[PDB]
């Protein structure tokens, strides 16, 4: 039957969820499963083995965090099943899995097997009435109130650029590169090892994520700023320690614009955006340059878009008006857009029937993938 549908954004690091017709995701919690790595002696301790949810951040000094989704592709399927059940848990949604149409998102160009296996989970473990899997870009266009644009996002693990012109998506112009937030944080962790801090545990890694979200900032000209010393921010650990970052506060998010630093022949995020535009036709290049829509949490770096303008302006043709729109709700654009598309009747004319899935299987979702 069709009750109020549920939108779930499988952000490779932060999963965002809520019902359709809403206006904000009230269920935002990081994506992992934390199991304890210590010994239990005192009866009356914490509860349960796995610790998905806010309890993880509340007791991170005990857990051994494991990420289920690496680069948008799920590795530990059992963890994603536990996380999805936690989304339907009594602390997050309280509904039953056999009650709502599910609007699952997905990073573009993910392997076929990922969609297939997600279908198996949602129609065998959960017995959902309906399911639809879509691109993350289209949703951001819904949440940004537009129809034409190039959604250049940066989730926690996959950055990509999808150029959509007047609601028509151009698949051959999609550029995907697997270097996002986790790689920025991982590279920053390596820099702190060279600064003498040796963060190597799992909880230490999420402390690095907190640093990346708070102390880093992007460059404008990394040589102008490389020849001069900087602020050297003093971040305080929860323990009470004191860490200094130095020039790595701007060298850490340089990995996005240049994967040569991490030792990887790939393209910058600017090259992804510019190529994604240029892989398309010629009559549309000017309009796509005039409508660049960001989303994704790894575009929230301070001083990011200004460097993006200097970069694309350095690459795009002469005097073309490059116009980047970056809203405040970039972190939830895919969720808000999922709510917008799921709050329609075309959505009823757009999902995949449970019966039809049982009759067909993988071929059903690969036909209705767009």
């Amino acid at each position: 039957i069709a009750n109020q549908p549920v939108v779930i954004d499988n952000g490779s690091g932060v999963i965002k969820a809520g019902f359709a017709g809403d206006q904000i995701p009230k269920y935002c919690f990081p994506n992992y499963v934390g199991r304890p790595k210590h010994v239990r002696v005192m009866a009356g301790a914490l509860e349960g083995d796995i610790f998905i949810g806010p309890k993880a951040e509340e007791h991170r000094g005990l857990l051994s965090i494991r990420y289920p989704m690496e680069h948008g592709i799920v590795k530990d399927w059992n963890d994603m099943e536990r996380i999805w059940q936690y989304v339907y848990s009594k602390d997050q949604l309280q509904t039953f899995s056999e009650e709502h149409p599910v609007l699952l998102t997905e990073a573009p160009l993910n392997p076929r097997k990922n969609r297939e296996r997600a279908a198996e989970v949602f129609f065998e473990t959960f017995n959902v009435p309906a399911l639809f899997i879509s691109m993350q870009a289209v949703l951001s266009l819904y949440a940004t109130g537009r129809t034409t644009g190039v959604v250049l996002d940066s989730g926690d693990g996959v950055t990509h650029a999808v150029p959509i012109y007047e609601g028509f998506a151009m698949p051959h112009s999609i550029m995907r590169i697997d270097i996002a937030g986790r790689d920025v944080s991982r590279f920053l962790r390596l820099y702190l090892r060279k600064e003498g801090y040796d963060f190597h545990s799992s909880s230490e890694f999420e402390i690095v994520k907190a640093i990346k979200e708070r102390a880093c900032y992007l460059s404008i000209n990394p040589q102008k700023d490389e020849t001069l010393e900087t602020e050297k921010a003093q971040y305080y650990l929860p323990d009470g320690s004191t860490i200094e970052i130095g020039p790595s506060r701007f060298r850490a998010p340089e990995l996005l614009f240049r994967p040569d630093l991490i030792g990887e022949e790939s393209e910058g995020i600017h090259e992804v955006l510019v190529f994604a535009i240029q892989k398309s036709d010629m009559d549309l290049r000017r309009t796509l340059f005039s409508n660049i829509v960001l989303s994704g949490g790894s575009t929230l770096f301070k001083g990011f878009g200004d460097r993006l303008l200097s970069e694309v302006k350095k690459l795009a043709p002469k005097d073309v008006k490059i116009r980047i729109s970056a809203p405040q709700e970039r972190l939830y654009s895919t969720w808000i857009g999922g709510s917008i598309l799921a709050s329609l009747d075309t959505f009823k004319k757009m999902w995949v029937s449970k019966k039809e899935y049982e009759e067909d299987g993988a071929r059903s979702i690969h036909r209705k993938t767009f």
């Binding site: 200004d306 303008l309 490059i322 116009r323 980047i324 729109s325 970056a326 405040q328 709700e329 972190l331």
Partner: peptide, 24 residues
């Protein structure tokens, strides 16, 4: 706005439109 406060991370005090100047 409260709707963009209640959430954990939001670009507070940042220009929303990045665009090249005039003088084409």
């Amino acid at each position: 706005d409260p709707k963009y406060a209640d959430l954990p991370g939001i670009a507070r005090n940042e220009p929303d439109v990045y665009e090249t100047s005039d003088l084409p």
